[PDB]
Design an enzyme around this catalytic site. Structure first.
Site, PDB file in Angstrom:
ATOM      1  N   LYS C  64       0.839  -1.188   0.000  1.00 39.29           N
ATOM      2  CA  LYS C  64       0.000   0.000   0.000  1.00 39.29           C
ATOM      3  C   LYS C  64       0.876   1.242   0.000  1.00 39.29           C
ATOM      4  CE  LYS C  64      -3.652   1.192   2.962  1.00 39.29           C
ATOM      5  NZ  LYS C  64      -5.040   1.030   3.474  1.00 39.29           N
ATOM      6  N   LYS C 117      -2.327  -1.653  -3.837  1.00 41.67           N
ATOM      7  CA  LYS C 117      -3.140  -0.441  -3.817  1.00 41.67           C
ATOM      8  C   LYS C 117      -2.238   0.780  -3.810  1.00 41.67           C
ATOM      9  CE  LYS C 117      -5.390   1.774   0.155  1.00 41.67           C
ATOM     10  NZ  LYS C 117      -6.670   2.496   0.009  1.00 41.67           N
ATOM     11  N   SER C 144     -10.218   5.315  -5.164  1.00 39.79           N
ATOM     12  CA  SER C 144     -11.217   6.332  -5.476  1.00 39.79           C
ATOM     13  C   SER C 144     -10.658   7.446  -6.349  1.00 39.79           C
ATOM     14  CB  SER C 144     -11.803   6.924  -4.179  1.00 39.79           C
ATOM     15  OG  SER C 144     -10.737   7.193  -3.283  1.00 39.79           O
TER      16      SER C 144
END
Ligand SMILES: *[C@H](CCCCCC(=O)O)CCC(=O)O
Ligand SMILES: *[C@H](CCCCCC(=O)O)CCC(=O)O
Ligand SMILES: *[C@H](CCCCCC(=O)O)CCC(=O)O
Ligand SMILES: *[C@H](CCCCCC(=O)O)CCC(=O)O
Ligand SMILES: [Zn+2]
Ligand SMILES: [Zn+2]
Ligand SMILES: [Zn+2]
Lengths: 340, 340, 194, 340
Positions: C64, C117, C144
């Protein structure tokens, strides 16, 4: 009394614990490196030179020999169920049509090319693969042009084969799949396609690892052609020969194969795996052979297994071993099942 | 006239030419990475608690359930034909003998341990392998001690299993083969053998890659024990799960396996190959399962294949994929054939 | 800690509890997204001691990264690092070496799967993961910011939404993923049919 | 009350602890395998045949079409800010200038060669890269010479292309970057340079992995040339085709590429990584395409992201994936930022 004994054990090591990854139905889908889809399926067609043909092939359950005027009615439900590809085998039964050099192989009025024109006109979304060989067209039933002694003549055979393959592509085949196993034939087929300005649009799908064995039974009972006078073992690889298969795989890739076929399939899953490493950048195709297909039908009928269960197990087996394509006589059943 | 066309081709590239390596019968033996010998063969025995037993197992052609007083007459021809190893499965049929914790598993008067003492006395050259599991001894037919909810209790199960395995070795088993697939059980079995001062003489042959599937049919019809109320899929690996099998293989080797079993066999040849790379320094064993064995018998009977031909093909298939051991119900036929 | 940096011990202790409690409540899978060193080990151990490891998938956000792509998320789940920066635990975008080490770590600590991610902008890390965690399912998270960037670009006429949606998401599969967490799932439920 | 629960945990394993490596601003620089510098940057120039041109390209924010007499005033600030390299695209707008064989491609009075002579005279420290293709010069807007049917003619196309590339080098280009994707063109370009005694001084920078997609929007709106009648997918690789890209990378390296371009960039970072392994001894270049460049401008304008932040993130992304070169329309902004 004999009581149940329990040994003292150490706390669980995290490294031991795998079941977290497959406890739920959707996880056994997560765990698959490739999932079976409908466009993966290639269904073989046996085209007769009798255009009104539709004859059951004794040892090939629910599979028949069909002529051109029976083809649209047979292929329409399938294409509308999701069939995307066919592999054509010609079965010329007219007397006088076989000969030493396999002349009828690329006869424009022959079942294969007529089958090609048919499908191209009435099913232009269908992807057409043509088997390339002489065994179906030779007087002696072998896959190439022989020497006077009866062994195979490499030069004249590959020369004959490249011509056929090019002619199938000229007629409109999208893909040629040479199944003869004669040394160096992929090179000459590729060169032939290049010189004919067809290499940019023709997929060469080599039967790179094709083995001798007891699994081709029903096929000969369909395409009528079983090695009279001799044995197709001097060109099909021996079942124990992993080294030769690996070399044959590197060879066909280096000679221009766009994809390779491993045949038979279940009984050669380890070779499929070998292929997935050696031909890692190429599509690998499993051929579930008529003997394997007949063995499953037989076992189910006898109650040893459930047809649909063992069909999904075997074919998911192909995908596990590295294949992303499957030539299978159970394609029509799979068109149904994959929906539900 | 349509005449046979021949394309102009290039001189043969040496790199294309493989047939020099398999043109003669003795070369197809040269080409094999391992040849099938008699001491490779392990024959399963199903021992009943009725000592005068000899009952045909419906779905396991030519295979029976035998009690101790019928064992010497049954095993004498085989040992004199070259049999070197057996794998024992107990089938206690006496009422009251099954229970929640699988108490009868290591009952000294139980079929397995009695079978062990028998063979050790009358056939002391025979190598004895014992299956290790609770499924044959539990009231619910599962391979370990359950939680109140019915899933499996890892801790109590492996605790129970290690005890059984050690007890089989105490009784004189040369090899224990745990077939439960419960996470971490090989570690606890090895530790149990260490603490019992038996690790230096006991082979731990793990069923490291055992898959769920449709091939275990006749087995349940022999050793009478099919997962009542539930599914053995939450511990057997999913057929598509290559990643999990690879992890399970590294795990069992790291936990102390001396060898590993891949089961089923033909339908999992690619996993055998995977195992040959990951467990390269360990003996790999193929288990030709009752469903695979019944499928071959059925196919032959139906004429799809020849029993002996497809038997040699399938079993040479194991050796090609990396196995150097085979547990097979066709061992008695192979004792005969390998001679001629 | 009193100073404001993160307290590893108490944090992972707190996290393992939450994860176990989610599984007790009936979650099939827990996906820890904190990036705090060693948390997968303690979550796995927690599940073991609760007799839930045999049925709980641990899907670690192993790689991440810090970045400019999490915009709308904070505008949804209302929570953006007041007083500080989540860069002392999210990996730096240039840190391939650290991501590779974080991937091996989480696998060794018990991850059943891993999440990369963000996704498009980290496809090379997905590839790295496909080699290091080759025996595990790899999951792409289309974040997003990435999702909003595609909607914006389409609206402006730079691209076609459905075309670039299929291109980006097939991009995940090409790089090694076999799972995708995506806000375009409802559109894909439609498209995959036709 | 629901209180905050805390599980008991084990002491920290050293193997868990990574944050020691990136707790400070200078460490996130330490952690990078390559840092972004100014000489890494290559800025594309679109040269019009109207020498007094300076026209905004609709869909290419802050990027224009410029003729020779507007070039020095446009390139002077940049070179003095650190620009080291340009990639030239010609945009001939004069009627009658396009034709079937792309004749205007290497027209000495054409925008590219005139652009070459300009820069060589007024900016002799600048490194000049020329795109090599016919799409900007053909009547039908495709990247090679077609067959009567409309597909591409490999032979005549690569023959035409090698000529252009050599002619660009004769005119003084330091580097040629063929972007057509037609099979084997790098070989013929290299051979052409050899026979012209220019291979020792010309960098061949192949667009080895160029994919079909939705990201080339603004480019066509600049260099005015979008595949009229047809689709550039039969030569651009399919987005899902990793296997083909890997093969295309090995091919171009083996045919003589001195470097390779991966295009588009962000959306193909995994291919860049693949390239960093296969072409490990060669410079790898990222092309941030007009669609990617326009998507970032759009997203920022909408408030989804900050332009400069996401610009540094994306471009550091190229370096992370293995690139050490970047062709980018944000070069002028980066000339500024890298200073501060
Ligand atoms: C035919 C090529 C494909 C194998 C036939 C598969 C089947 O359905 O049995 C040549 C094989 C041969 O007969 O040697
Ligand atoms: C029994 C262990 C070996 C597999 C039996 C092989 C056969 O002959 O079918 C447990 C397998 C099970 O029933 O799940
Ligand atoms: C939340 C975990 C998943 C990333 C959110 C993805 C998205 O939709 O933006 C923590 C991320 C964070 O805000 O640091
Ligand atoms: C032009 C070669 C480089 C790609 C253009 C990059 C961009 O700024 O969009 C041929 C590409 C094409 O239009 O197919
Ligand atoms: Zn043939
Ligand atoms: Zn069991
Ligand atoms: Zn072009």
């Amino acid at each position: 009394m004999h009581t149940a004994e329990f040994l003292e054990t150490e706390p669980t090591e995290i490294s031991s614990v795998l079941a977290g990854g497959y406890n739920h139905p959707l996880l056994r889908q997560w765990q698959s490196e490739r999932q079976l889809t409908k466009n993966m399926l290639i269904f073989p067609l046996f085209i007769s030179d009798n255009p009104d043909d539709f004859t059951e092939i004794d040892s090939l359950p629910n599979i028949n020999r069909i002529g051109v005027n029976r083809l649209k009615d047979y292929l329409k439900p399938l294409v509308a169920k999701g069939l995307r590809s066919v592999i054509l085998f010609g079965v010329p039964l007219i007397p006088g049509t076989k000969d030493p050099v396999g002349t009828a192989a690329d006869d424009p009025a022959g079942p294969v090319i007529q089958g090609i024109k048919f499908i191209r006109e009435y099913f232009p979304e269908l992807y057409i693969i043509c088997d390339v060989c002489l065994c179906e067209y030779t007087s002696h039933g072998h896959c190439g042009v022989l020497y006077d002694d009866g062994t195979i003549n490499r030069e004249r055979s590959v020369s004959r084969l490249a011509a056929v393959a090019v002619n199938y592509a000229k007629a409109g085949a999208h893909c040629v799949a040479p199944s003869d196993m004669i040394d160096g034939r992929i090179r000459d087929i590729k060169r032939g396609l290049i010189n004919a300005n067809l290499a940019h649009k023709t997929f060469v799908l080599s039967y790179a690892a094709k083995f001798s064995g007891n699994l081709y039974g029903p096929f000969r009972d369909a395409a009528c052609s079983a090695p009279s006078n001799g044995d197709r073992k001097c060109y099909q690889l021996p079942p124990a020969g992993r080294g030769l298969a690996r070399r044959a795989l590197e060879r066909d890739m280096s000679e221009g194969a766009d994809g390779i076929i491993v045949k038979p399939s279940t009984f050669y899953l380890d070779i499929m795996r070998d292929a997935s490493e050696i031909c890692k950048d190429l599509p690998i195709c499993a051929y579930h052979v008529s003997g394997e297909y007949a063995m499953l039908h037989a076992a189910a009928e006898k109650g040893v297994v459930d047809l649909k269960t063992i069909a999904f197990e075997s074919h998911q087996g192909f995908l596990r071993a590295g294949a992303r394509l499957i030539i299978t006589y159970l394609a029509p059943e799979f068109l149904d099942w994959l929906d539900e």
